[PDB]
Amino acid sequence: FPRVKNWEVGSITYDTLSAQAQQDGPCTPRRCLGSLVFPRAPEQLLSQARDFINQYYSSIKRSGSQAHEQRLQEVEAEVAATGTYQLRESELVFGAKQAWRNAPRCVGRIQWGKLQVFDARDCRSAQEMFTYICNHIKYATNRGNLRSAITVFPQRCPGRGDFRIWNSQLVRYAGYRQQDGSVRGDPANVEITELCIQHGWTPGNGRFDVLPLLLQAPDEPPELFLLPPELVLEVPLEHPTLEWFAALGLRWYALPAVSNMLLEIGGLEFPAAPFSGWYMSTEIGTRNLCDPHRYNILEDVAVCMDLDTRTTSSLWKDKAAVEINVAVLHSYQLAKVTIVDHHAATASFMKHLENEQKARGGCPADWAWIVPPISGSLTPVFHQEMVNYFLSPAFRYQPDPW
Amino acid sequence: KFPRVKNWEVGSITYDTLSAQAQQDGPCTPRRCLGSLVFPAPEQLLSQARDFINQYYSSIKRSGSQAHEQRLQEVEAEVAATGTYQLRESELVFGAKQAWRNAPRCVGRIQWGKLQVFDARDCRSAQEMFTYICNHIKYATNRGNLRSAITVFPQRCPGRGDFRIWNSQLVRYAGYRQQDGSVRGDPANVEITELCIQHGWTPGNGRFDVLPLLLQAPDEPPELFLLPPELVLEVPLEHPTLEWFAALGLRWYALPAVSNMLLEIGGLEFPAAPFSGWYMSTEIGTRNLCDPHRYNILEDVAVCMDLDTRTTSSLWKDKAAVEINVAVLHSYQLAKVTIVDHHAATASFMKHLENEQKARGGCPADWAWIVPPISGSLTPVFHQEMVNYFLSPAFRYQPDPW
Numbered sequence: 001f002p003r004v005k006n007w008e009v010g011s012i013t014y015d016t017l018s019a020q021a022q023q024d025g026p027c028t029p030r031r032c033l034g035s036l037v038f039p040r041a042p043e044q045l046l047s048q049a050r051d052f053i054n055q056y057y058s059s060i061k062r063s064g065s066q067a068h069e070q071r072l073q074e075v076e077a078e079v080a081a082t083g084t085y086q087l088r089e090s091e092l093v094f095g096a097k098q099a100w101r102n103a104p105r106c107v108g109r110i111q112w113g114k115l116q117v118f119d120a121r122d123c124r125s126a127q128e129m130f131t132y133i134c135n136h137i138k139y140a141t142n143r144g145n146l147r148s149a150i151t152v153f154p155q156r157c158p159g160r161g162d163f164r165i166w167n168s169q170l171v172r173y174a175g176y177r178q179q180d181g182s183v184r185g186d187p188a189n190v191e192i193t194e195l196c197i198q199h200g201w202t203p204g205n206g207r208f209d210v211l212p213l214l215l216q217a218p219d220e221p222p223e224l225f226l227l228p229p230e231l232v233l234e235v236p237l238e239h240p241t242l243e244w245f246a247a248l249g250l251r252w253y254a255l256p257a258v259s260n261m262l263l264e265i266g267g268l269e270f271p272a273a274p275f276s277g278w279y280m281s282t283e284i285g286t287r288n289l290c291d292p293h294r295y296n297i298l299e300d301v302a303v304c305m306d307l308d309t310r311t312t313s314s315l316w317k318d319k320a321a322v323e324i325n326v327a328v329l330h331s332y333q334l335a336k337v338t339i340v341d342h343h344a345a346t347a348s349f350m351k352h353l354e355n356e357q358k359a360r361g362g363c364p365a366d367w368a369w370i371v372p373p374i375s376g377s378l379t380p381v382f383h384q385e386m387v388n389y390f391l392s393p394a395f396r397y398q399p400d401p402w
Numbered sequence: 403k404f405p406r407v408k409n410w411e412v413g414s415i416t417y418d419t420l421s422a423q424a425q426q427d428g429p430c431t432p433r434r435c436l437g438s439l440v441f442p443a444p445e446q447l448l449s450q451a452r453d454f455i456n457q458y459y460s461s462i463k464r465s466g467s468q469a470h471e472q473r474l475q476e477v478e479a480e481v482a483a484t485g486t487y488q489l490r491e492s493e494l495v496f497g498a499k500q501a502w503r504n505a506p507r508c509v510g511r512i513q514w515g516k517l518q519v520f521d522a523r524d525c526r527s528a529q530e531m532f533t534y535i536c537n538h539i540k541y542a543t544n545r546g547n548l549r550s551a552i553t554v555f556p557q558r559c560p561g562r563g564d565f566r567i568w569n570s571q572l573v574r575y576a577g578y579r580q581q582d583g584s585v586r587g588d589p590a591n592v593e594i595t596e597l598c599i600q601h602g603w604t605p606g607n608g609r610f611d612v613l614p615l616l617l618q619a620p621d622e623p624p625e626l627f628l629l630p631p632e633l634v635l636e637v638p639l640e641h642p643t644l645e646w647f648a649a650l651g652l653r654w655y656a657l658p659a660v661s662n663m664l665l666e667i668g669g670l671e672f673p674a675a676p677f678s679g680w681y682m683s684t685e686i687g688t689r690n691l692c693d694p695h696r697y698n699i700l701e702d703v704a705v706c707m708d709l710d711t712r713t714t715s716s717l718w719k720d721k722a723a724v725e726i727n728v729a730v731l732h733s734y735q736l737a738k739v740t741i742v743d744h745h746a747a748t749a750s751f752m753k754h755l756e757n758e759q760k761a762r763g764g765c766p767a768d769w770a771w772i773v774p775p776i777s778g779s780l781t782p783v784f785h786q787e788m789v790n791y792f793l794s795p796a797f798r799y800q801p802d803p804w
């Protein structure tokens with residue numbers, strides 16, 4: 001049982017939950033790979049299905065009960081008859097929340113108990129995918145009062161194709177290569193943008209052109225769908241006191257909706273299960289806008305601020321970054337779109353760690369992803385030792401469908 | 403294969419083949435990563451000594467030579483007769499440099515080949531130890547043109563106590579436990595302060611009182627030595643444009659000199675081997691001055707700056723911390739004391755990683771310590787995946803001698 005210290009306060013806890021780590025991570029006694037982003041029949045499915053049901057009934061305080069034993073024999077006969085099994089809607093809701101609760105890299109898990117689960121397991125064809133996704137977006141956007149939600153499309157099953165959303169997020173800005181070698185728009189999205197062009201989309205030429213959706217029903221090629229502009233809430237960026245910031249023409253979208261991760265519950269796998277919450281401001285103002293391989297606007301903002309950019313020790317990068325994050329915070333609040341700054345978010349995650357220590361003896365957390373990308377040690381999570389491990393139900397990365 | 407390591411700013415990948423040579427085990431297992439935790443004999447000596455000798459003769463491009471073979475046999479014979487051995491002078495110099503090169507939490511390792519190595523293995527008393535330490539401080543400080551140096555005191559041997567420096571650094575400010583439970587001075591140093599008082603030091607009552615040294619000769623209680631004030635170079639802190647900042651009365655010292663780690667070379671252990679370089683500004687400006695459990699000046703500086711400290715979303719913490727780092731850099735530069743900002747230091751560490759990929763096929767590096775505590779993703783090391791593992795020669799933590 002690892003001893004976990006907080007160095008700001010001196011408090012000690014022991015993570016007993018890590019003993020339940022169901023799968024293996026990338027680290028060994030010889031070498032730690034915790035900084036790597038991506039770190040690498042019937043009998044099998046049944047063991048995982050049995051374990052999840054025991055979790056579920058333990059969590060509702062009905063373990064070993066009558067309904068408990070009936071579900072166990074239900075899934076057994078289902079898998080024997082069909083080779084898979086279907087979750088009850090309540091088990092689906094429970095598994096979706098747990099998979100969020102178990103995500104080590106998510107700082108927003110204080111909210112894990114409040115998640116809207118939309119059951120799309122009866123979906124067929126991409127046109128119905130698009131309708132489910134639009135309803136998700138409208139519900140989750142909620143005119144700027146953002147609400148967490150997930151939509152769960154049909155599970156993988158043998159002999160059949162997969163439901164897949166080709167886009168990594170529901171809202172993504174295009175990235176276009178030039179013959180001067182550079183990218184106009186989001187360099188992260190060059191590949192998906194040319195796929196959209198290949199699959200019928202006629203491309204714009206702005207820095208913030210919202211990509212279409214490439215939706216794939218089983219065994220059919222992906223279908224191109226355009227999101228109605230009225231559906232896609234965006235926030236033009238301005239600064240409270242730097243009047244010229246608006247003129248930079250920056251903007252971001254309201255809804256962070258990850259659409260390319262795989263949801264695993266009780267040995268079942270959902271390759272299409274997009275989820276959304278609301279943004280932490282550093283995601284936009286630090287990573288999306290200031291990463292050198294993304295919009296990379298830091299020097300543009302610094303020149304507008306008349307900073308000394310030819311010596312590092314003036315901390316011009318640090319001052320420009322802060323004001324960009326100020327602008328993001330100011331603009332979302334002014335537009336009445338839900339946002340949380342990195343101080344408030346890390347303070348809530350500390351409370352989450354305390355809640356989770358009592359609830360199950362630990363919390364899997366990935367320090368490198370929890371600590372914000374600016375002002376790390378100014379937040380309480382920097383001084384908190386953490387233990388990273390994999391629990392199920394879970395979200396997992398997965399190969400691109402192409 | 404070996405671990406694949408990606409740089410996300412550039413898209414380039416390397417493979418760390420050096421990690422496969424890791425000797426001592428770390429804290430991680432396939433079940434759980436503990437990378438975020440701060441603190442996690444004949445035949446064994448010979449293997450370590452032989453490997454070290456092999457390292458030495460590799461470094462001078464004389465592997466497999468007569469001299470190489472004869473030195474291995476010479477080490478073998480001395481271990482056979484005495485259970486231990488003595489390093490040649492050249493080996494001690496090479497070994498100390500390798501221990502710095504191998505230190506995974508050090509971002510300053512571009513400098514690893516430039517290290518002044520003081521051989522104090524003939525030290526016999528705490529008085530002689532103090533003279534060696536004063537020579538080190540004078541050499542390394544060099545009136546502000548700092549020079550990296552290490553002084554190596556006698557190795558551990560059977561039947562005689564160790565040399566130890568009780569202080570964690572050669573220069574530290576007193577932390578006086580207040581009757582309230584608060585601290586005046588540096589809270590990190592309350593324990594060593596109380597040990598100095600208990601050992602006869604007449605304490606001061608300021609926030610920046612330089613501590614005396616408690617030096618331990620073999621099988622002796624520690625002895626108290628006052629550093630001559632002219633030996634301890636300090637920098638008054640001021641801000642280039644916030645003239646009230648000087649009135650805070652803040653100072654820091656020039657010389658970062660770690661004195662409580664154990665240097666291990668070829669199986670031999672040197673429990674006293676203080677080493678020094680020069681500061682990276684975030685150590686002083688972010689951690690030492692803004693940690694809640696250290697000098698904790700952030701709110702005070704922000705209030706003086708007339709920032710709105712009642713809402714986290716103004717980013718008043720980030721703005722005040724940036725200016726405090728500016729003050730540190732400005733004040734060291736004004737005083738003509740070597741200092742490196744976190745942008746320049748991390749850019750040079752990227753160069754080090756590239757040199758080491760070519761020289762050795764990898765580099766042990768602890769991402770959470772290499773990424774600076776403000777402005778993390780504005781530096782290139784944030785986007786560099788890293789592999790953490792233990793090579794020898796090494797600097798190691800060791801128990802406090804009390």
Ligand code: HEM
Nearest residue numbers: 100103105106107108111148149275276277278279280395
């Ligand atoms: C409600 C507000 C939320 C906030 C503020 C938030 C914040 C974050 C942040 C900052 C990250 C790091 C990702 C990055 O740096 O790109 C992250 C990762 C993650 N989030 Fe949350 N999130 C929220 C809601 C959710 C919800 C509703 C789910 C699922 C139901 C979720 C699941 C995940 C997962 C699986 C990851 C890890 C993916 C990865 O490795 O990057 N989050 N979150």
Ligand code: HEM
Nearest residue numbers: 502505507508509510513550552677678679680681682797
């Ligand atoms: C020359 C300029 C140098 C710079 C700018 C530098 C920078 C740093 C920094 C910023 C840290 C993290 C310290 C902390 O947060 O507590 C560190 C750790 C470390 N440094 Fe360097 N360093 C330098 C020289 C040296 C030298 C000369 C040695 C040894 C010969 C050394 C050995 C170490 C070791 C072993 C650690 C890890 C200690 C730990 O685990 O806390 N450094 N260094």
Ligand SMILES: CCN(CC)CCc1cc(F)c(F)c(OCc2cc(C)cc(N)n2)c1
Nearest residue numbers: 188256257258261275276277278279280283
């Ligand atoms: C693959 C390349 N990187 C950079 C684009 C991916 C980063 C990333 C990968 C994932 F899998 C994620 F779920 C992810 O969630 C960000 C997020 C999600 C939610 C619901 C809320 C929020 N506030 N934030 C972020």
Ligand SMILES: CCN(CC)CCc1cc(F)c(F)c(OCc2cc(C)cc(N)n2)c1
Nearest residue numbers: 570658659660663677678679680681682685
């Ligand atoms: C022990 C409590 N914290 C903060 C005092 C970490 C202590 C610490 C222990 C070590 F072994 C270190 F090598 C260390 O390196 C600081 C450092 C060292 C050198 C040579 C240069 C530099 N620029 N910086 C710092």
Ligand SMILES: C[C@H](O)[C@H](O)[C@H]1CNc2nc(N)[nH]c(=O)c2N1
Nearest residue numbers: 035036037368369784785786787
């Ligand atoms: C190499 C490193 O793991 C990579 O850049 C990580 C570090 N920490 C992160 N933290 C968050 N929240 N998001 C990220 O994308 C990353 N990227």
Ligand SMILES: C[C@H](O)[C@H](O)[C@H]1CNc2nc(N)[nH]c(=O)c2N1
Nearest residue numbers: 382383384385438439440770771
């Ligand atoms: C708990 C966490 O590991 C701890 O606060 C670490 C994080 N990274 C660090 N990095 C450096 N350079 N120095 C430190 O003291 C720490 N502290």
Ligand SMILES: [Ca+2]
Nearest residue numbers: 178179180181
């Ligand atoms: Ca051309």
Ligand SMILES: [Cl-]
Nearest residue numbers: 256283284288
């Ligand atoms: Cl994003």
Ligand SMILES: [Cl-]
Nearest residue numbers: 658685686690
């Ligand atoms: Cl220090």
Ligand SMILES: [Gd]
Nearest residue numbers: 244303304306
């Ligand atoms: Gd101007």
Ligand SMILES: [Gd]
Nearest residue numbers: 642643644645
């Ligand atoms: Gd002024």
Ligand SMILES: [Zn+2]
Nearest residue numbers: 027032430435
């Ligand atoms: Zn690890």
